[PDB]
Amino acid sequence: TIPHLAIDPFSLDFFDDPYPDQQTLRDAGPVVYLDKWNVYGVARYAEVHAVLNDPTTFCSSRGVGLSDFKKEKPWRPPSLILEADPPAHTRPRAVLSKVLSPATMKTIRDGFAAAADAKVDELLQRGCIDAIADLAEAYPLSVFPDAMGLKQEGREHLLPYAGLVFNAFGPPNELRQTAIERSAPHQAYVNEQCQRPNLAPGGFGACIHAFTDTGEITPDEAPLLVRSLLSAGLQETVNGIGAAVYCLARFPGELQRLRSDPTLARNAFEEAVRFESPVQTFFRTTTREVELGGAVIGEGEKVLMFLGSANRDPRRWSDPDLYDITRKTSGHVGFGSGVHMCVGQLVARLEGEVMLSALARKVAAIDIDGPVKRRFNNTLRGLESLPVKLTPA
């Protein structure tokens, strides 16, 4: 009663243009079986939203990649928040929520915003730039690692470790094995910067270590929670900002609208997050037999959620393939939904908003003027290179 498909959502051809295959996955049925990896798939907004919001039946403590932690060893000690279920998840989540609080955004906002303006001002002096390396990448590297409290040496390890983390959610294909065999130096730098003496006072990491006397987490838990923010805190944002820029370059009517009202910047980024879904997919594991969209899924089965496909589901979105900076984006799953919904979304939206605001005030046109290149990853969607000519306003 469940349609079996041979689509590999982790193949290179799929990454190259996922969107037809995602329609085929949505239209086959509410639940599909993916024979290549032996997992269930859900690609419609409805079923994705349901799975995300039933963490008792679709837990994350057996991993949220293909590997089931009850069967295989994880490639690194489990995250205390991503790879945990309530109740063990609850208090480490409260710590990271407070570390990344509204009050904390108040303190870095003007710094983040200035750095966005300085970066756009700097790129307008060059004209022809690469909006991935010189912007999408350069901007978050200039404000996140300082906000984390990190030393300066070794920062070249952060994006590679992020790409490793997201590649290791995927199946044991060559992208994953090659990331793991390249991993050791990045693992080593990251784990070391998680120790309390290496985290500059006032930053996010020091704050995490300072939350250890409340009975919410203990001191030996602090290093791993810092690790979370060195894993999840960079590449997505970069991909999300690279997508905004791309969209603004590819849809010049939306750039003309952003310029006319820069207050649209925040929702313009939110729309980029929905349109690109930098995190394309996550897994859950069933803790019990369950009925999902008229199928009966046994205990201990991996379920693949297509988040980017739920964000383009014509059953939920009008013209889902169009980038509309005035769209009501509320409800998209680009950040998840429910108990694990991105705990750092306030940092991402603040980075992306102030970047787009900067562009909206200072740029008249953005024109692709060279070969666009994609970056392949088992979990992340984003560009490798996006040569643009920026035109000062």
Ligand X SMILES: COc1ccc(C(=O)O)cc1
Under rule CB under 6 A, which residues in 248-307 are in contact with ligand X? Answer: 279
Determine if 163 is a binding residue for ligand HEM (CB under 6 A).
no
End-to-end, the C-alpha distance of the chain in Å comes to 58
Instruction: Count CB atoms within 10 A of the CB of residue 47.
Output: 24
- In DSSP notation, 306-331 reads EHHHHTT-TTTSSSTTS--TTS--TT
Give least dist CB 234 to ligand HEM, A. Answer: 7
Decide: helix, strand or coil at residue 274.
helix
At residue 189's C-alpha, the angle toward residues 187 and 191, to 5°, is 65
At residue 66, the 3 state secondary structure works out as coil
What phi and psi values does residue 297 have, to the nearest 5 degrees?
A: -100, 125
State the Cα–Cα distance between residues 201 and 193, nearest whole angstrom. Answer: 13
Q: Which does 358 bind (CB under 5 to 8 A by kind): Cl ion, ligand X, ligand HEM, none?
A: none
Looking only at residues 55 through 84 of this chain, which bind Cl ion when binding is defined by CB under 5 A?
76
Does the footprint of ligand HEM cover residue 221 (CB under 6 A)? Answer: no
Q: Which of 227, 302, 327, 340 binds ligand HEM (CB under 6 A)?
A: 340
Asked if residue 333 binds ligand X (CB under 6 A), the reply is: no
Per-residue tokens: 65: 């990649």
* # residues near ligand HEM by CB under 6 A: 29
Q: Which of residues 267-326 bind ligand HEM (CB under 6 A)?
A: 273, 278-279, 282, 307
Pairing label, strands 4-5, 32-34: parallel
| Residue 204 burial (10 A CB sphere; 0-12, 13-18, 19+) | buried
Contact 47, 30 (CB under 8 A): yes
Contact residues for 374 (Cβ-Cβ < 8 A; gap 6+): 15, 16, 382, 383, 384
> Which span sits near ligand X by CB under 6 A: 124-132, 224-232, 242-250, 314-322?
224-232
212 binds Cl ion (CB under 5 A): no
Identify what 165 binds: ligand HEM, Cl ion, ligand X, none; CB under 5 to 8 Å per kind.
ligand X
Stretch that binds ligand HEM, among 170-178, 227-235, 286-294, 319-327 (CB under 6 A): 227-235
**Interactions with ligand HEM, residue window 61-90 (CB under 6 A):** 64, 81-82
187 is an interface residue for Cl ion by CB under 5 A: yes
Stretch that binds ligand HEM, among 26-34, 92-100, 254-262, 369-377 (CB under 6 A): 92-100
* Residue nearer to ligand X on the CB measure, 39 or 165: 165
Using CB under 6 A as the binding rule, whether residue 55 contacts ligand HEM is answered as no
Identity of the residue, 163 or 240, whose beta carbon is nearer to ligand HEM in the bound complex? 240
Question: Which residues of this chain interact with Cl ion, rule CB under 5 A?
Answer: 76, 187
Question: Which residues of this chain interact with ligand X, rule CB under 6 A?
Answer: 79, 81-82, 165, 227-228, 231-232, 279
